[PDB]
Structure formats: structure tokens, C-alpha cells
Amino acid sequence: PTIIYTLTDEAPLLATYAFLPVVRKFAEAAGIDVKTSDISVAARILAEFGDHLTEEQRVPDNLGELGALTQDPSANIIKLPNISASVPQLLAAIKELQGKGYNVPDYPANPKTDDEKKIKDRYAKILGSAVNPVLREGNSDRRAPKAVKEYARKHPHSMGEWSQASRTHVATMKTGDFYHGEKSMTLDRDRRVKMVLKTKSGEEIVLKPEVKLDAGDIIDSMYMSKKALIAFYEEQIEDAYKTGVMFSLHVKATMMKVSHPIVFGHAVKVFYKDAFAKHEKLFDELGVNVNNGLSDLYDKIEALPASQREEIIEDLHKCHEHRPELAMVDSAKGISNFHSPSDVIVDASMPAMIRLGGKMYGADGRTKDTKAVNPESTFSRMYQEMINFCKTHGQFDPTTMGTVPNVGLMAQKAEEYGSHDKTFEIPEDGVADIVDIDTGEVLLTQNVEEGDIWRMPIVKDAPIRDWVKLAVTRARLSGMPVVFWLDTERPHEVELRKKVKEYLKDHDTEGLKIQIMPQVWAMRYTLERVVRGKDTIAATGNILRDYLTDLFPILELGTSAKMLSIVPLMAGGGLYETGAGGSAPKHVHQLVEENHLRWDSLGEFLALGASLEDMGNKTGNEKAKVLAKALDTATGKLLEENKSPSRRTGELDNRGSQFYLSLFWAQALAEQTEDAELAERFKPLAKALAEQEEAIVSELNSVQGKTVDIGGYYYPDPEKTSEVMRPSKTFNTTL
Amino acid sequence: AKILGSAVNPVLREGNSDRRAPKAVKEYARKHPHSMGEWSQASRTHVATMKTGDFYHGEKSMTLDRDRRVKMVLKTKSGEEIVLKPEVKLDAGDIIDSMYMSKKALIAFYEEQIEDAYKTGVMFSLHV
Amino acid sequence: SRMYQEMINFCKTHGQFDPTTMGTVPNVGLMAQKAEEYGSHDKTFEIPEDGVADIVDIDTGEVLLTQNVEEGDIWRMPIVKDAPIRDWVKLAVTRARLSGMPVVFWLDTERPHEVELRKKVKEYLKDH
Amino acid sequence: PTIIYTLTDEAPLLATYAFLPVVRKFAEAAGIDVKTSDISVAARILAEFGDHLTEEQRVPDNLGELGALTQDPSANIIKLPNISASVPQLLAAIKELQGKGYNVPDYPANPKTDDEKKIKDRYAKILGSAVNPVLREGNSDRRAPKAVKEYARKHPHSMGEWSQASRTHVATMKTGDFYHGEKSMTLDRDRRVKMVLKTKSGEEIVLKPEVKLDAGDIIDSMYMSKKALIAFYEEQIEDAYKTGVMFSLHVKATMMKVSHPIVFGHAVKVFYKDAFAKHEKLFDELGVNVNNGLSDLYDKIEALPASQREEIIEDLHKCHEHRPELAMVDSAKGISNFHSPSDVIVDASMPAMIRLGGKMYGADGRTKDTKAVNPESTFSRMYQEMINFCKTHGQFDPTTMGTVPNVGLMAQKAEEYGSHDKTFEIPEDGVADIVDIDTGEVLLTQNVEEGDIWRMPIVKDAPIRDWVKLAVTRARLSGMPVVFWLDTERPHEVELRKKVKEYLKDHDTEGLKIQIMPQVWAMRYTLERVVRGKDTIAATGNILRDYLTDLFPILELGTSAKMLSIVPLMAGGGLYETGAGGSAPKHVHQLVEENHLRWDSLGEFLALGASLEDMGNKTGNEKAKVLAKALDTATGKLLEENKSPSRRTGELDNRGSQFYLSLFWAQALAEQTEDAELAERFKPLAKALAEQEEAIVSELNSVQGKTVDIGGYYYPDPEKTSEVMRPSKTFNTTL
Amino acid sequence: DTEGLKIQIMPQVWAMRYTLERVVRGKDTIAATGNILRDYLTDLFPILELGTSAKMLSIVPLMAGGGLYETGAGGSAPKHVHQLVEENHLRWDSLGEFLALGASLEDMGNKTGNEKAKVLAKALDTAT
Numbered sequence A, D: 001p002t003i004i005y006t007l008t009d010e011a012p013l014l015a016t017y018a019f020l021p022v023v024r025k026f027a028e029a030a031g032i033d034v035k036t037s038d039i040s041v042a043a044r045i046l047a048e049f050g051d052h053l054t055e056e057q058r059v060p061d062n063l064g065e066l067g068a069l070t071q072d073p074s075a076n077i078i079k080l081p082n083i084s085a086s087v088p089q090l091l092a093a094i095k096e097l098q099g100k101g102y103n104v105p106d107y108p109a110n111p112k113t114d115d116e117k118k119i120k121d122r123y124a125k126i127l128g129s130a131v132n133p134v135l136r137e138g139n140s141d142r143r144a145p146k147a148v149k150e151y152a153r154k155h156p157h158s159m160g161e162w163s164q165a166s167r168t169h170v171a172t173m174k175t176g177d178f179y180h181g182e183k184s185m186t187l188d189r190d191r192r193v194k195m196v197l198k199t200k201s202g203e204e205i206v207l208k209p210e211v212k213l214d215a216g217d218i219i220d221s222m223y224m225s226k227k228a229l230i231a232f233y234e235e236q237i238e239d240a241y242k243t244g245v246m247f248s249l250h251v252k253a254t255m256m257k258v259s260h261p262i263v264f265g266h267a268v269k270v271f272y273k274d275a276f277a278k279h280e281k282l283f284d285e286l287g288v289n290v291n292n293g294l295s296d297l298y299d300k301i302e303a304l305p306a307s308q309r310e311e312i313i314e315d316l317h318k319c320h321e322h323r324p325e326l327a328m329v330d331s332a333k334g335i336s337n338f339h340s341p342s343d344v345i346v347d348a349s350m351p352a353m354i355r356l357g358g359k360m361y362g363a364d365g366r367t368k369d370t371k372a373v374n375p376e377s378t379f380s381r382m383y384q385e386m387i388n389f390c391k392t393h394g395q396f397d398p399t400t401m402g403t404v405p406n407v408g409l410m411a412q413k414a415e416e417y418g419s420h421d422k423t424f425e426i427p428e429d430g431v432a433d434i435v436d437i438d439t440g441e442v443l444l445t446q447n448v449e450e451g452d453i454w455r456m457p458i459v460k461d462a463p464i465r466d467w468v469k470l471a472v473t474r475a476r477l478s479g480m481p482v483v484f485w486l487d488t489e490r491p492h493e494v495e496l497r498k499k500v501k502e503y504l505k506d507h508d509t510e511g512l513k514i515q516i517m518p519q520v521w522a523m524r525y526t527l528e529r530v531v532r533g534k535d536t537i538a539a540t541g542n543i544l545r546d547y548l549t550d551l552f553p554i555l556e557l558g559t560s561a562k563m564l565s566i567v568p569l570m571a572g573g574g575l576y577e578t579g580a581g582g583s584a585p586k587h588v589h590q591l592v593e594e595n596h597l598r599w600d601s602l603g604e605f606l607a608l609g610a611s612l613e614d615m616g617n618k619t620g621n622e623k624a625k626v627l628a629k630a631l632d633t634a635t636g637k638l639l640e641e642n643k644s645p646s647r648r649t650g651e652l653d654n655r656g657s658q659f660y661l662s663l664f665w666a667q668a669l670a671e672q673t674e675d676a677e678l679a680e681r682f683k684p685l686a687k688a689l690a691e692q693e694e695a696i697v698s699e700l701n702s703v704q705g706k707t708v709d710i711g712g713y714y715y716p717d718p719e720k721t722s723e724v725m726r727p728s729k730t731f732n733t734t735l
Numbered sequence B: 001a002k003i004l005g006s007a008v009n010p011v012l013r014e015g016n017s018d019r020r021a022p023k024a025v026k027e028y029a030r031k032h033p034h035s036m037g038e039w040s041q042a043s044r045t046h047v048a049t050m051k052t053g054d055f056y057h058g059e060k061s062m063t064l065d066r067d068r069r070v071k072m073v074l075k076t077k078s079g080e081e082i083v084l085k086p087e088v089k090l091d092a093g094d095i096i097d098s099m100y101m102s103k104k105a106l107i108a109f110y111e112e113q114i115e116d117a118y119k120t121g122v123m124f125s126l127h128v
Numbered sequence C: 001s002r003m004y005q006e007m008i009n010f011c012k013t014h015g016q017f018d019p020t021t022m023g024t025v026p027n028v029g030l031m032a033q034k035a036e037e038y039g040s041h042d043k044t045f046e047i048p049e050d051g052v053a054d055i056v057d058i059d060t061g062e063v064l065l066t067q068n069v070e071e072g073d074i075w076r077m078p079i080v081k082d083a084p085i086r087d088w089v090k091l092a093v094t095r096a097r098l099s100g101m102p103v104v105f106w107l108d109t110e111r112p113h114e115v116e117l118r119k120k121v122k123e124y125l126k127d128h
Numbered sequence E: 001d002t003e004g005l006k007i008q009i010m011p012q013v014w015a016m017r018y019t020l021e022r023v024v025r026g027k028d029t030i031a032a033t034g035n036i037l038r039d040y041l042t043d044l045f046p047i048l049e050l051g052t053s054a055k056m057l058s059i060v061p062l063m064a065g066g067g068l069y070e071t072g073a074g075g076s077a078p079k080h081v082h083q084l085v086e087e088n089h090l091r092w093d094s095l096g097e098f099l100a101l102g103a104s105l106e107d108m109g110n111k112t113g114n115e116k117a118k119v120l121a122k123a124l125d126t127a128t
Ligand SMILES: [Mn+2]
Pocket: A347, A546, A547, A549, A550, A580
């Protein structure tokens, strides 16, 4: 019986070093082996480019290893947050590996040879959201545990007031976006299809040559219009200008790597319509692509003669005086919403804005109301309901409000999350058809234009069946009502409806409140009961899973770090994400400069409990059951005793919190009475740890306030990292 | 006092309201649209209303079993009983409500709303 | 008043209504025999001093509805009779059948008076 | 805002002495006054016979007082278990009261002078089940609270295995009993009726002069043929003998105080017919009434000369040679089934027998199979189905089985529970009619014989309406389907069916599974469901309410002493029974002799929670809600921490468990955040109690293991009892 | 979307009786029928109601999106010609052509957004 514990990047990794030894010590008491899997950015680079490496240097394909392991009914994988590499991050990681004797190739930005174009594609496999599409072979069960909600109640986080006179709102398209021209259908049998564009010339361009579809698959033909999108941006910028409200843009270019940078880019184009007109010729032969934000423009003009570059920056600030005020990522540095598409990520930025009382930062560094532009309507309308609701009701009260768990459809690159390699920026005007290869049958027709974003999302029948089952299970186990958020006026969501209606009958739903509502209705109904302190479960698609599991946890708890994220793997196993967020680069900074790690490991403690509980239910391990029960109360006690990491250096940090957890864990195991072997086994552990409490905490705190050597960043040296992360002689030995 | 105010309506209204626009009028409106003020997504106008201490949030109600004669009385702190309404004839199946608005809640609400309208710079209005 | 706010919100997000495309909203209103608030004028009082306000059956000593009120508070007892309610439900059905349009009874769940009405509507719909 | 807590008899009262102070302290924080009410056997003797008592000695008619309070829409009564006095109990209570200066008359068993008849008739008000009929002005909502059910799953109680080859069965009449001769009708209008017997002679005997009947009342005219009853017994006693299976008899002479002793008596008569023939003349003038069991015979022969009394007992033990084996109540002492009608009580004995695997105890001390004789078929056939089910399915599994909550028609002396003053042993062969005085119309005729038992049960229309409402209420609120146990072949239940069918339509039953099935079908349907882990509500008549709320809880939980018994009164208030069992005489035995009370007050804690919660809803007291939910979580923690009273002397007792409850109740209020004032109010208290925990516990346990002085039994001294029941001064001073 | 519509299916005999029962007392009913019944009925009732089928609309909304407009279901009337060649009087009623053209221009207007074609259709409707 074995649990895989992922070694990842930056902060969670550093924490793992201190925590792995303690989980291993507790897990062996139930005959559980804990093996690491290194899926760091460095490890993934070394696994891809083994060619130029020695035998000792080479790394196995650890990501792909886990990808296979998800097909095994006995899988038990605990996934920690890891880096989704941007280009700058990849570059830094390559230079660190090269510097350490690993001959890996330079990343070729603009490749001049055909062999450079070849390795740039191999690097593309490392860039961006690479891990998640592989590991997510089950659906999402994301929710906050009772002990965490009770902590929020006892220590209410700061929330900004919602004035009834608030001017902030969600501006979104009403025609010409993906939603309003969308086509959809469920497949009657297995088909192999192609995406073609029948041009005005009579020609037929092939955009995607072959894609294998199955029986019961739901496929969409959706497109956004370049013309409608520009017009929309024209209207909303002028409106923001006339009404005097700060302009902001909220998309997710990190994940939607094809469509969303185009959308982001157009916003910038029309906002600065005037400057991009005066410098059209210069910009094209400079190759500036502002889809990468203003960051791309500033970069390609930084090396220009002063007077020439200073004319361009003038034409940008001159364009501002008849434009609305812009939201700032960092006003002190002068970094705006338009700088980089990776700066303002929709799933995080929107809740941040709502929590702050519908506010974002301005040029002067003061919080302002905003027109949160959310071009695609499909998933943005639900935000507006909350805003409106908030205007009439005020800010949410974290002390009294209910919870909104989520049962998200995400398995096997579900819906939009798998459509990246099937999204195309239409080259010229024409008619876009998806066509069956083995028969001249046109399946979904659409009339598109030059610049349009066309795409074909896919959701498979098997994930859908599991998703309905997961929703029913959660209804049954928690007693909470579940609402499926499915529109009637969105073809894709009426297709899902047909399946949800059918597959609900294949279960025992006798005493369960289960209904289906359009998103805006569903959001309202949910808000209506949460404000009265009642709980509701949201059964949603992939993107809504993303949006809602940031929105509500941030409002309820103040963060999305302190929650359960369980993935019941379809083959029978289980994946346990410890965090939906990043790997916290700023956290590492504080540790390396003055050794205080302020990373909260509660998400790791929670996932482990879920992992141990499911291990017992699936393998018949009674000891694992007892370990899970003990850890839960230990986690609960850690919250109650307020022994989570402080942010201020010199005070209790991640390392100290891990001690208290292990103390309470050993304590719980000593005073439990369903397993006598374990009770007496941990009795001396609990006794030893409690009696040396103040010496251990002393050691773990007196070591702070100084620079520390971890031997790198993207590839830390284990020996030196282990020293830093386990500095208490007393704690190490007594363990 | 019997001539003052809305005197006519409560005497003639011995039925219920079937109020509706006639098709000819609705069809004329479609063909000849009246002017409508445009709504700004950034509009600051809102209904301000009480959250506690109004009729709604302290209301009690019942459906009556039988015909009875009730009075409305205030049992004062002193022990004295002031009769406010000597007699009212209730029928079986009558829905009656006991309903009150707190003076103190109303003044607090008003001080908060007037102040809020000022601090935000939005124009105050009262609709009764 | 909350109804108005919903429209305001709706209007902020959807814009102003278009008279050339919008549908009708006819009303079937309960009003017969000085129903609800429209008859409560003779039964509304500005409370002279702090005390308990009860509505009491004069024959026998049964206190039907009690309430704790303050000096300056406004307290009232609205009435709505059973046969008007019967007529109102029937009129709703008749208007539904004749026009062929859906009908929504605007009745709250968190308002005592409107739950009492709800009981009768649920009953008298079975009579048609 | 007043809660009425009932002072009763024996163990529950002793627990109250320690608990009343701590409930008062909590209830005052919400503005609720806890007012006492004394309904003990002693206080009921005093209230009746205030003839020779001083002003200070006199007590109000506390039962009549509470009976009157049920009409008050604000009634909040907590009913603890109380004595339903037998003759020996009555005498002992009288003798103690006399010796303490209370001048009350002796109870004359056989009144010599006619003045003794009046005071014997006045004592008849005190005898037996006198409290329940007065307090039950509502219908029964009996169910096991979720937290208790969960505890039974984690800690299963022992259950005897059911052999497929088991021979045990229910024996019951197929003709000549109440069921197979029943006539019933629903009243058209108000009537006044008399019960008359027109004899064969021509005389008219008035058994009941007048009874006032309302419109919509159901009345029955049921009788049991004496000739049939004896022939049945002859047959069954013979069958049990021939087949070699143990004979047992299960009736309820305790509450069915008129009919069932006649039923019990006849069994003894035909069983020992050979001895009752040899001594018929002697038995006659001794006034032997074996309707009171063999104990009656043994009493009346104990005074006789040795050679004669020994001859009698020899003719009784000699009769066993041609007879079947008898089930024993105490096989060491030789106390059998026939000793006393109050030993084997159908509602408790039948579950106990099923729980054991279909076993009762033998003369040899061994457990064996039994012919469980239940003469009246009406409510016994339902037991047989379970026996059959178990025979094919095995014994129930407490770790996986569902629940069977009950909604019981009992309000206003419903059905058989209010037919005692209307039951008659027929003096001679005739026709038994219930006749209207105004217009000499015979409503129901019936041809009866000498010995036959005749009765007219009554169930009023208004109770039936509330009963149906409570069924739909429970269905809506719990999501469980509900089944009405109504026979198609029983007049009474077809009359009820007419009503249920109609009154259901008066309610919103849109999302509910609600159906009507005959008893045996309903039982089978319910069993088919529990065994698959599914829940079902039983909406039943009065006697079935009693049977099923012992039966299922014994199987699910091991006891009927750990559950909610809510009585929503028809006038608006609520009565909350804390227990359905006795007042535990033996528990007092252990308290006075060795200072350990093993009474489980869980039923009190649960009832109080349901008392405080309903206080919040009815009045609008939000502070009541907070106390209720905090007691709910306090009671739940009591179970999970395993701190219910031990039975062993020297360990944690009733007093000790009351400390832990009040501790957790205090903690739950301190660490909650839905009421700011209450939180900081209990904060120092909760901090106090927890701090000297193993000091208070140390006191409450050290004082055990010795004889103690409470100053009486039926009327214990309030000053002495309070010293004993609150022996921890550390604990007491803390409030 | 059939929510406010009365739609039902009956056998031919029943449907005919049902239809007759309503039309004998001024009520209108649409007959949704198969091919031969379409023929039979659009002669029968138009003859009974109007005397001829040469005074009605026969619109064929073409499946591909267009529209065919039959001006008459009857023949080309040879005897009308005999009168025109011998006496110079054409008694042919072109009312079926006026109505068809009116339906043609109206569909033209709604299909292609032509407002001037809509105005031609309405002016023809009133002229007819
Ligand atoms: Mn997210």
C-alpha cells in the first residue's frame, strides 16, 4: 500500500522537505509506504532533454509515470501546487541547470534554423499548464471542511464595504461572442472528424486534420467575432470614459493559451487605437505582438534610440487623456492591467475585486469602482448577479454565511480545458465546418470572418456519468441540496441537461434535493440561501468549477488555500490537490533572505487526511482509518490552538506549525481507543514531543532572522535544503 | 373626516382587480414607442429600505377558526390598560396581522441613509 | 419596496426596456372589502408609551397576537376576509384560461401574512 | 417564556436534583424561567386526599394543572418517566407519607363499610397509567436522533443469531377475537349514547349510562368470544406441547387494565384446568383472581395450614407433565410467565425476544425457541412478519440498517387507550348495542355471550387531522417516505382510511412519497427497506405507535431509552417525553446503598434541546435557538467522547456525565459566533469548568462506594437529596 | 413553444364533428391534416363559408426558406374565356391574385429587411 507524494516547486517543495519525514514516520505505523515523484519544472526539463545528459544526470518521465498511474485502481496521489512556467521562468530554470553541468539547450524564442524550431516545440510541452491536463482523470470534489469554516467564523477576515451607490459592474458581450452563435450536439456513434474552412475562393483549408470522437461525446462549434469584439471594446471604453469609472480587463490567458491572448490583445489595440496607427509600420517589422500585453511592446522598443522611444511612450500617455482610467497591477511601479495577460487572472482577480467591495487599484494607488470587462458572456453573467445581489444586501458576512461546495466536470480534458489544440484564429472570411472523414457529412456549420476565434470543445460521456454520480454522492453524504448550473439557451448546456436528466435516474436520489437551473438563477438561489446561513452544492462544468471554487472560498474564508480538493479517479484511485493556487515565489524569498517560511501547509494536512481515509475504505486498512481520524482532530486542534504560520519573520513559521501538527497528531493517536497497538505506540511520541515543546519551538525560532543557503532555486540541493528545513536538533532526534 | 381622503374607493371596491392593457393600446405602443430614459450600467440609483425594525420584520399573522369579537389594547409599564380600539368584528377564515414599525429603527435608518447619500454624493428622495 | 430594487438591478444589467418588443404584465389583485392594508386606517395607532400591544378576544380572555412596542411606534392590524380571497383565486384562474398566459402568485415565504395567504391559494386552486 | 420541568419518581427525579440547577443557569441566559411541577405518586396522593392536611401540607392538582396548560398555545412541558403505581407501590407510598405526618387514608383492598368505597374509588385515580392520558393532547413524533443512530453504527450492540430452522412464531386468533367481529362507523353528527345489554331474559342492563360523542368521531363495537379464546388456548397449549416448543404469553395488562387481565387470566385457567377443578370450591371463597397471575393464588394460599398449601402447589407442578414448557421471568426463583401480568409486557418482551434471535428463557435456564402467544390478532400479525423475515434474512445488522421513525395517532385518549372506562365483561348471553338516547336508534348491534369482553373505543376527528398533518410535516422535513399502516379488512382502519385519503389532499404533498398499506404489507415493505439501509416513517394508530417505538429502536440501537419523543400539542405548544420506560427502581437501589446512579439522562438532554429549539420558533426567541444548537452539539460530543454513565460502582455515574454535558454545553456556547453576548457570557464559565475537570471528576468519583441518606423513597427530602446529588462543591460554587 | 396554445389530436370523424360543433356557433378552428384531407377540406369549408375557393389565401412556405403563393385551387375556367372572346367580358375574379401578391410582398419585407416592400403589402391589404 503506497501513497505518491509529489515534489514540486518553490514554497510547497521547501515545506515538503520538513514534512515528508514526519508523514513517513506516521504512515509506516499502518504499513503505508510514501514514495516521492519529482514533477518540478527542473525535473520536467531534464526528462525531456536527456539527449545531452549523462546516465547519472537523466531523469525518468515522472509526469507521464503518474499519468499512467491514474489508470490503476489503487492509485493514491497527493498533488501539491507547482509552477506553470512562463517563458521567463523556463529561461531561469534552463540557466540554473546549464550552470550545474546539465547541458540542456537554450530556449529559442525566434528560431532561425529548422532544428531550433524542433526543440522549441519540445520546450512547449514544459511551458504553461502542463501537469493538470495529465493528472485530472477524475472529476472535482472541492469543498471546505467544517473545522476551516469554524475558524473563519472565529477569526473573521477583512471584507470591504459594498455601497448601494457602487458603480462597479460586469460588462460583457450580448452578441457575436462564443455563447450567442454557439452550436452543439451529442454524438450517436464513434466518428473521426476534421475542421475545415471553405474559403470564398472555393478552396478548402484544413485547420485540424483528424480528431477521434466517440459515442456519447458532446461537441461544440463556437466562435467569437473580431468585429463584434472590437465594437464591444469601442463601446465599453467610451462608456467607462463618459461615466468616469475605472476600466479593467479580466481573462485567463495562462490556461486559455490560444483564444484569451487574442481577446486581451484586441482590448489593448482599440484602447490605444491612436498610437498603433501612428506607429503601424514600425511595430510590424519590430514584430510587436501586444497579445502578450504592453510588456511585449515596451520590450521591443527598449533598445531603440532615446528620442524615438520617448516619442512612442508619449503617444501612449497622450492616448490616456481621452480614455478611461486604467486598473493597476502595481501602481507604485507603474504596471497596469494591460501590461501582461498573466498579471490579472479572471478566477483570482474577480473574487479579489468583489471581496474588496467591488474595487481595484488606480494610478494614484487608491481603491476605485471598476467596469470589470469580461468579454465572453458564457461564464461572466454569474459574476454580475453577485455584484447586484451585493449592492442590495451589502458585503457577505463570513461569520454567518453558509458554504458553497462544488462538484466540477473536468475529467479527461473536459470541455474548454481540452480545446486549445482545436482553437484557430480564422485566416480569411469563409464557412467553418466540422466534417466526418468517412462520409461527406457536415455535422456543424458556421459562417466566420478574418480574425474570428473558432473552436471545438469536447466532453466525453464517461466523465459526465461519473460527474452526476459524484454530485449524488455528495448530496447523500452531506445532506446538502445540489443545483446543476445549466442554461436552457446555451446549446452545450441543454446537451448536458439531456444527460443529467437521464443519468440521475440511474441512482438512489429518494431523499435528495436535486434541481437544474440556468447559471444566473442558480447563482441567485445559492446567494439567497448562503446569506441565510444555508449550504448549497454547485454541480457545474469545468470553467465554472474554476471560477466558483475561488469565488466562494475567498468570500467564506479569505483564501482558496485552506480547502479540500478531492479528485475521485475514474479507474478507482484518488488524487488529492493540496492547493489551487501557485507555489508562492514571494514565500521562498523571505525564507532564503531571512529564514522564515510563511507557507500555510493546512492544505497538505487536509489532503493527507482525505488520502488516509480513502486508503482505509479501499484496502480494508483499519490502522489507516485511525490515522485519518487522528490527523483530522490534529488539524482541527492546530486551527483551534491558532498554531498556523505567522507572516512576520521571527515569529512561528511553517516549520513550527508542522511541529504542532505532529504533536497533536501523536497526542490524538495516544488517547484513542479503537486500536490498542497504535495507542501505546504513539504514547511515548506524544509524551516526548509535549515535554520538549518549548525547546523545539525555541530551536525552530532562534534560527530565524538570517540568510540561508538552499543551493539554488528551481533545483535546490537536497542536503542544504534539508538542513535549513529541519534545523531543530531536538525535534529531528526525538522523531 | 368621512369626506376627506380616499373615501370613494373602499366603498365601491366590492370585487377584485382585473387591471390590464387592451391589445389595441399595446399594439399602438409597439408601432409608436414613447421615449424611455437610458440605463447606465454605472448608475448609482437604488431603493434604500429597512432591513430590521419595519412592519415586515416583526410581523405576526393568523387565519381565524371562528367568528369572534376582539379589541386592541396596550398594557403599559404602569400596569394601566389603554383601550385603543374598543371593538372589531372578525369572521371565520379572516387573515389578521399584528404589525409594527419601531420609531427608533426608523430614525436610525434615516440618519444612516441621509448620511450615506451625502458621503456618496447621491441625491436623496422619499417615496410614500 | 424590494420588488422595485430588483427591476433597478435588472435594468442596470440589461438596459432600459424596449416597448416595441416587450410583453405585457396584467394584474389580478386582491382588494375586495377593504382588504389588507387598505382597511387598516381605523386600526393604526401611534403608540403613546412603552408597553405590550395585544389583540384580545373580549368574550373569553384569549390573547391572539402579542407584540412589544415603544413610544412613538406605529402599530396596526390589517384584515382580509375569506370570500374575497376565494374570489381572487377564481379570477386568477379565469384570467389564465381566457388569455392563455401563465400566472405567478407573488407571495413571500418569510412573511407571516403571505404564508397565510399561501395556504388559502394552495387550497382554492384545488377547487378549480 | 416558561419551561415546565416535571418532578417524578425514583431515578429520573434523582437525576433532576443534580440537573435542574444546571439547566436553570443556561435557560436564564435566554430569559426562560424553569418552573417545577410535582407529579410523583406521593404528590398525586396528597393532591387527591387534601382532606386531613394543613395549608402548608396541601399541594395543587399538579396533573390537572398541566392537563389544563396543554390548552395554552405557549405550553412547554418536559415529561420525565414516572411510576404507574401498582397496589404494592401505592401502599408503600401511602405508608411513607403517613409516617411523615401526612394524614392520608389507608387503601382498603376490600371495602367493608360503604365509606371505604368512596376513598378506594378516589385512590383508583392514582393507580396505574394515570399521567399519560392527561398530558397526551397531541400526537406522537418518535424517532432516533441522527447522532445516536451514528453511535450505534460505530459501536454495535449484541444481537442473537436467527436460525433458518427456528421454530418460534406468533400464535394468534383467526376468529372470535376483537378483529374478526369488529363493526365500526364514523359519526354524522353530535350524539349522546348508552351501552346496553338486552339479555335473553328480557331485562336491559345498562353497562355505561352516557358518553358524549362529537361529529366526526370513529367508534368501534368490538368483542372477544370467551368460548373462542379458551378453545384457542386449549389448541395452542396442546400444539406447543405436541411439538415440544416453549409456551409464552405476551399481553399488556399494565395499561389495558380491564380487558388484558381477563385474557391473561384465562390462559392460566385452561393451562392448569386440572388443579383449578380439584380446588374450585376453595379458590372461589378465597376470592382468588388469577387474572392477577399466579402471584394472586400463591398469596391467598400462603396463610393456609402447611399440609394444605403444599397439596395445592403439588397439584400445580403435577399439571406440568401433560403441559408444554413455560417461559420464565426468573428461572432461579422459579418465577414464570404466569406469575404476574406485569412481568411480561408485550411492547417490551416481543422486541427482547426478537433481539435475542427468537429466544426466551426456560425452566432449565437455557434460552430456546417459543410460541409467543398474542391472542388478539389486530396488532400481533405484524410481529409474525418480522419473525418470518428474520428466519430468511438473519438477524438485523445495526451497522448498516436504516431507521423506522413513527408518527402515532394518540391524542385525546385515542382508540383503545381511552376505552378502559368503556370495556365490560359480559354478565350473561344477550345483544350488545350502543343506542342513542335522543331517538332510540341502535348504531351498532353485536351478539355477545357470558364471559365475552366488550368495548367501545373512540377516536376524535380533530386528533386525526393533526396526525395526518404531522405525517406530511415529518415527510417534508426529513425527506423520508411515509406509510400509513391501515388494514382494508378492519372496519376501524377503513374508517380511518376514508379520513387519511381526504385529509392528505388538504396538504401540499408535491415532492413526497406517501402511501397506505395494510399492517403486514407495510411491515414487509418497511423491512425490505431497512435491510438495504433505507429509512421509512410509520404513520400508525395508538397501539402500533407503542409497539413499533419499542420494536425498531431495540433492533437499531439496543434500547428505547435513547430517543426523541416529541408531542406537538394541538393548541400550539409542545410536550417532550424524555423516556418511554420505567423510573428504574434498581438504579435507586444502587444509589442509596453504594452512591452510584447509573441512570442515563441522555433522553432528558435530547428533550431539552427539542424544547429549547421549539421555543425559538414559536416565540421568536433567537437566544433559545443558540442554546438549543449548542446543547445539540454538546450532547453529540458526549456520545463521541464516550462519557455516558457507567453501570459499575466506583466509575463515572449520572452526576459525572451531567458535569461533562454542562462542560461541553458551556464550551459550545463560548466557541460559537452567531450570538456575541452569549459567547462572552459563557466564556469564563467554560474556561472555569475545563480547568478543574480532573478535580470535579475526582470528587464525584471518590464519594462513591458507600451508603447514602436521601430521607425517603417515594417522597425524598429535598435538602438531603440535593446534598447527595450535588456532592461536588467545586462544581457547585462554579455557578 | 406551445404553452398558451390549445392543440389536440382526434380521429377524422371526431375532429369533423368537433369542428362542425364550433363553427355552427361562430367559433374558428384550424384543421391540421394530411394531403388528401387538405384538398377535400379546403374545398368543402371555403365553398360553404364563402361560396367559392377563389377568394382565399393558399400560402406554401418553401422548406429551403422561400415562399410559393397559389392564387387559386380551382381550374382555369374555360367558360370565362368563352364570354371574353364572344362578348368581351371577363368575369374572372382576380381577388386570389391580389391577396397572394400581398402575402408575397409581406414575406419579401420580413425576409430581406425591405421596409418599402412591407408598405406596399399593407397598402395592398387595405386596397383589397
Ligand atoms: Mn482556480
